[PDB]
Design a protein around this ligand. Structure first.
Ligand SMILES: *[C@@H]1O[C@H](CO[C@H]2O[C@@H](C)[C@@H](O)[C@@H](O)[C@@H]2O)[C@@H](O[C@@H]2O[C@H](CO)[C@@H](O)[C@H](O)[C@H]2NC(C)=O)[C@H](O)[C@H]1NC(C)=O
Ligand SMILES: *[C@@H]1O[C@H](CO[C@H]2O[C@@H](C)[C@@H](O)[C@@H](O)[C@@H]2O)[C@@H](O[C@@H]2O[C@H](CO)[C@@H](O)[C@H](O)[C@H]2NC(C)=O)[C@H](O)[C@H]1NC(C)=O
Ligand SMILES: *[C@@H]1O[C@H](CO[C@H]2O[C@@H](C)[C@@H](O)[C@@H](O)[C@@H]2O)[C@@H](O[C@@H]2O[C@H](CO)[C@@H](O)[C@H](O)[C@H]2NC(C)=O)[C@H](O)[C@H]1NC(C)=O
Ligand SMILES: *[C@@H]1O[C@H](CO[C@H]2O[C@@H](C)[C@@H](O)[C@@H](O)[C@@H]2O)[C@@H](O[C@@H]2O[C@H](CO)[C@@H](O)[C@H](O)[C@H]2NC(C)=O)[C@H](O)[C@H]1NC(C)=O
Ligand SMILES: *[C@@H]1O[C@H](CO[C@H]2O[C@@H](C)[C@@H](O)[C@@H](O)[C@@H]2O)[C@@H](O)[C@H](O)[C@H]1NC(C)=O
Ligand SMILES: *[C@@H]1O[C@H](CO[C@H]2O[C@@H](C)[C@@H](O)[C@@H](O)[C@@H]2O)[C@@H](O)[C@H](O)[C@H]1NC(C)=O
Ligand code: NAG
Ligand code: NAG
Ligand code: NAG
Ligand code: NAG
Ligand code: NAG
Ligand code: NAG
Ligand code: CL
Ligand code: CL
Ligand code: CL
Ligand code: CL
Ligand code: CL
Ligand code: CL
Ligand code: CL
Ligand code: CL
Ligand code: CL
Ligand code: CL
Ligand code: CL
Ligand code: CL
Ligand code: CL
Ligand code: NH4
Ligand code: NH4
Ligand code: NH4
Ligand code: NH4
Ligand code: NH4
Ligand code: NH4
Lengths: 527, 176, 352
């Protein structure tokens, strides 16, 4: 039997067998007042506190969210859908600790992605047990509010001030500060890591003065707050708060009265309308997201970054080889997971209308011009390949690289990777390549599990990723020092070195997508 | 190894086996086939070329190093032989420029660019393709050891070709 | 010492650790231990460091050995705490008697029971902490003796004796290697022979005798000391390296053993200062100078003899790698000790 005593009271966990040893897990410890009724859309309030043992033995409720139903029965997409009941009562966290219980261990805190409208910490590919077993770190993950329930904003007004889900995260980091010593963890050695919207969130915790003292270092996988999809302008957040009220028939006059109407609506009504508060959405749409609230975020983050107003520490930033491909099957014409999707020039041009709804004609011509100068054969997979590249370069790779240059210019060590292995188990077809989101299983160490049908080469690559990530958390240097591995150089402007991760040979390369990012970073902002 | 290092001691030959058969990893049956190709190429061709280039450049002259990696779409030898010894020559002399010849368009483009670079080298001592927005070819210095890859897709600037392998051939093996 | 030395006149804020062999490896480990960071100022490592091949036991072999001892004392239990409990009844002679063969192949260098990665004193494999600069930032003074290896050769290498000159044949050298690298592959052992028996040249019968001494000293002592010093200094601290090369005029071991492992200690503690003791005058002078340098190091972090026109001791940096020789005649500034030999042990040999 395993009871730990926290500030708010006692929690019981369970023991798990993992690769011949043991891990202790506490799944679903509460970390705030559930945000129900009167507390909907408000910031997260502090826990009432208890007596008796809370049984932290199963995953908790995932937060209310719309579900992906485009490929029912298909593992490639259902793997990202929630696997616990949905409910407004969802402010919970998970801890995995090594056994025997550590003395003063480093802590990794996961923050899931999901375009800020979805996600949950209880997914299979986020299971922290392997990291705890293998590297003797403690792993933590939290559930945070997504969609309007988490990011609806009417700024000033504390009834719905914006950024609620980010404060949910902040208060979870807080919990770790106060409580992790009891579980064996070092509150002075905490690394945040996250993917996609999770990576943008971690990047925003670097800007937030209220987060400065709640963590040590940061890992950003395929995401950063300067990505075009990451922050909503105060302007559009109003248009959207108002469009939702109109749609639910909640249109009031006094602003606090709108919010009050919205607190009576059952959560299904709110999810159902969320979808079209934008008049032209894309597969990348973030209906309800971070905003400049004047609390969590004090100014436009482009500005803070440019002028070096962030926490000074080491970062590890990286991206996948085919980030864009995954979004092409959610509505670009001529694309299918069930065929090779050879597309014509007309279909490419139309594809652009789907991804840059408006965006002028000249703007769109200029993307076509810079991505369709053929080198050369024809080569029918040519427009198919270009559209993938456009969506990945613009949304993921170029803003990651631009974040890294800017951050490092202020004197901190930065490390950049380019992940290029296609998983031998991927359920999406070949032409989709090394997809957005498919490094995660590598980082959490699933290929370490032999029954799992990964290749040996894949096991080796995972074990090495795990070591590098863990050395980063504990030391700020992501080397594999023992098995004669390639040394990972720091990223400076001027040279811009980065490391490639694959099953064959790791390489040191320079200036990823130099040509493409000159386009997105200096030309395109002006259209 | 007995065929390629007739004598050459037992320990000498064990040391080649040791440095080229530490498996990374799968098994992966094409493994010893691949290693023997690499042993003969590294020892006979690649490592002495790289060592010549370092030494020559250390005396103040500009040097330019390439790594040719395109397998000709017409090669009559089978796949496992890859980008063979001697099969860049047709590229340098510009045979793929001839359209009747059944080379791919991509191959025509790569040849035209090799020809320009070789010719700019002869006339100017600088093997750039200056007009069609080509990758710039950096000079080879010791310390950094940059070189240019030549292929039909994307030319890259890389550093330190076969670093591990050539440490073996250049500093360990002369002593056996 | 932290709590009590003020009462005796001592400065708890000025403490230098110093130790030899396993003592030197221990001091080096106190530099890694977060619980020791605030208990001392500076460190002196004589012939020993935690990266030496004999210094840390892997968690793996420590289990095999705990279990082999229980089996041997007839203490083999099932519940782990029950094994320990059995072992607490055994009288200490029974435990010493079996300690000896919990290893199936021991060497004269064997460390049956040693430091391990406990997750308390030591939180990770020390190779890693060193490489990634996770140690106490301070000055160190590190050094080694000219013939570290010779002493271990008389505890079981065939053809060796303190009572003769131990001229050995090639077969005896090859066999010697089986004693010191029990397993260790055939190719591994051939590669030691190859790199230490390319003759320069005469023959010269003391040749294989000399090489085997050098193999054991280079691998166990000198090369890991030098590698520790490079790595430590790369993180910005002053480091000072010495090469001790005086054979004591009183040494009771024979000539061919040279400047043995352990025979600088009497110099450091100042025994030759005692005149009745039958050391030479030259030896008195050398001791007095070692004592001053060690003491200036403790109080100041700089091991100079400033008054009697002594040779200045340069700091050790990577790139140049200067070190000071200590002998009765002339102290010299030299560079890159055992450059050739350590390239072998440090980059080639870990891979066998
Ligand atoms: C800010 O608000 C209006 C919202 O109009 C929208 O009403 C929502 C409830 C939703 O159903 C949505 O699809 C609908 O369009 C935007 O004005 C609309 O814009 C479109 C295209 O310009 C017109 O064809 C609509 O008829 C028009 N509707 C109204 C009522 O005016 C407005 O564009 C938006 N601002 C931005 C920047 O997107
Ligand atoms: C690849 O398939 C797409 C996707 O749409 C189709 O899914 C296919 C697997 C098949 O079942 C097809 O019947 C289904 O419509 C094809 O795109 C579609 O093309 C046809 C043209 O006649 C139209 O009916 C659709 O408007 C169009 N829709 C979309 C959403 O793309 C595509 O042609 C096909 N390409 C191949 C096989 O190379
Ligand atoms: C881990 O444990 C066993 C221990 O075997 C040993 O038993 C001790 C009590 C001691 O007397 C010792 O000398 C004895 O060998 C090792 O297995 C042994 O290995 C040797 C050589 O390989 C064999 O010839 C023994 O018969 C064999 N004994 C048994 C009982 O298996 C084992 O090798 C060891 N692991 C390591 C890495 O050294
Ligand atoms: C130096 O002596 C060694 C050590 O063993 C010997 O000790 C000698 C001083 C002497 O008393 C001798 O009788 C005693 O055995 C000699 O090695 C030994 O050589 C003989 C060969 O006939 C064997 O009996 C032993 O197996 C062997 N043993 C060991 C443990 O080394 C060595 O030959 C001698 N060398 C000289 C004098 O140059
Ligand atoms: C646990 O270690 C504490 C400090 O360790 C950390 O120091 C930080 C400043 C940062 O360098 C981290 O990455 C270090 O690992 C120490 O202050 C505590 O007292 C320790 N507590 C224990 C053992 O209970
Ligand atoms: C004794 O001296 C104390 C400090 O001396 C030391 O300062 C350390 C930081 C380090 O530089 C040492 O090597 C110095 O020699 C001082 O703080 C005490 O108060 C003194 N106490 C006495 C005289 O009782
Ligand atoms: C929590 O867990 C244990 C399971 O052994 C159970 O016996 C205990 O009463 C549980 N508490 C509950 C359900 O409140
Ligand atoms: C709007 O009504 C709220 C809700 O009780 C009240 O507190 C606030 O003072 C009102 N403001 C205006 C401008 O009508
Ligand atoms: C390094 O060492 C072992 C074999 O010696 C290997 O199996 C392991 O996976 C490697 N370690 C890391 C951290 O990659
Ligand atoms: C550059 O220009 C033309 C087209 O503008 C092209 O066909 C030609 O092959 C290129 N020149 C070289 C030297 O590669
Ligand atoms: C083993 O016995 C000890 C000694 O009293 C006890 O405390 C422990 O709980 C036991 N564990 C197992 C797994 O039998
Ligand atoms: C320096 O000075 C005296 C003689 O002037 C000498 O005997 C002494 O041993 C020397 N001091 C040191 C510290 O070596
Ligand atoms: Cl690419
Ligand atoms: Cl057109
Ligand atoms: Cl590698
Ligand atoms: Cl470059
Ligand atoms: Cl690129
Ligand atoms: Cl090019
Ligand atoms: Cl490099
Ligand atoms: Cl290479
Ligand atoms: Cl010498
Ligand atoms: Cl022989
Ligand atoms: Cl002197
Ligand atoms: Cl020199
Ligand atoms: Cl030397
Ligand atoms: N997967
Ligand atoms: N995702
Ligand atoms: N050919
Ligand atoms: N040839
Ligand atoms: N002595
Ligand atoms: N000793």
């Amino acid at each position: 039997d395993i009871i730990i005593a926290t500030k708010n009271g006692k929690v019981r966990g369970m023991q798990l067998t993992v690769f011949g040893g043991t891990v202790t897990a506490f799944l679903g410890i509460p970390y705030a007042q559930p945000p129900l009724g009167r507390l909907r859309f408000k910031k997260p309030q502090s826990l009432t506190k208890w007596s008796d043992i809370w049984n932290a033995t199963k995953y908790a409720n995932s937060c209310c969210q719309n579900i992906d139903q485009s490929f029912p029965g298909f593992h490639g997409s259902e793997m990202w859908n929630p696997n616990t009941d949905l409910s407004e009562d969802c402010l919970y966290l998970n801890v995995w600790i090594p056994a025997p219980k550590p003395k003063n261990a480093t802590v990794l805190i996961w923050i899931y992605g999901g375009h800020f409208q979805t996600g949950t910490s209880s997914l299979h590919v986020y299971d922290g047990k392997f990291l705890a077993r293998v590297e003797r770190v403690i792993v933590v993950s939290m559930n945070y509010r997504v969609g309007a329930l988490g990011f609806l904003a009417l700024p000033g007004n504390p009834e719905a001030p914006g950024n609620m889900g980010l404060f949910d995260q902040q208060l979870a980091l807080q919990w770790v500060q106060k409580n992790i010593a009891a579980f064996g963890g070092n509150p002075k050695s905490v690394t945040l890591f996250g993917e996609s919207a999770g990576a943008a969130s971690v990047s925003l915790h670097l800007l937030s003065p209220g987060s400065h003292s709640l963590f040590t270092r940061a890992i950003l996988q395929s995401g950063s707050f300067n990505a075009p999809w990451a922050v909503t302008s105060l302007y559009e957040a109003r248009n959207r708060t108002l469009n939702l009220a109109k749609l639910t028939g909640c249109s009031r006059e006094n602003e606090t009265e709108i919010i009050k109407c919205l607190r009576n609506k059952d959560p299904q009504e709110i999810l159902l309308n969320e979808a079209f508060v934008v008049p032209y959405g894309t597969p990348l749409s973030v209906n309800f997201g971070p905003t400049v609230d004047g609390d969590f975020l004090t100014d436009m983050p482009d500005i803070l970054l440019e002028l070096g107003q962030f926490k000074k520490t080491q970062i590890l930033v990286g991206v996948n080889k085919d980030e864009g491909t995954a979004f092409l099957v959610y509505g670009a014409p001529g694309f299918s997971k069930d065929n090779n999707s050879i597309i014509t020039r007309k279909e490419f041009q139309e594809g652009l209308k789907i991804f840059f709804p408006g965006v002028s004609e000249f703007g769109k011509e200029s993307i076509l011009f810079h991505y369709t100068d053929w080198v050369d054969d024809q080569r029918p997979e040519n427009y198919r390949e270009a559209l993938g590249d456009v969506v990945g370069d613009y949304n993921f790779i170029c803003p990651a690289l631009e974040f890294t240059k800017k951050f490092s210019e202020w004197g901190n060590n930065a490390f950049f990777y380019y992940f290029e292995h296609r998983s031998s188990k991927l359920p999406w077809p070949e032409w989709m390549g090394v997809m957005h989101g498919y490094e995660i299983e590598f980082v959490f160490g699933l290929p370490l599990e032999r029954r799992d049908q990964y290749t040996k080469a894949e096991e080796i690559l995972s074990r090495s990723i795990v070591k590098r990530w863990a050395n980063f958390a504990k030391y700020g240097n992501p080397q594999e020092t023992q098995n004669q591995s390639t040394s990972w150089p720091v990223f400076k402007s001027t040279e811009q070195k980065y490391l490639t991760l694959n099953t064959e040979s790791t390489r040191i390369m320079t200036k990823l997508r130099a040509q493409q990012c000159r386009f997105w970073t200096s030309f395109f902002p002006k259209v």
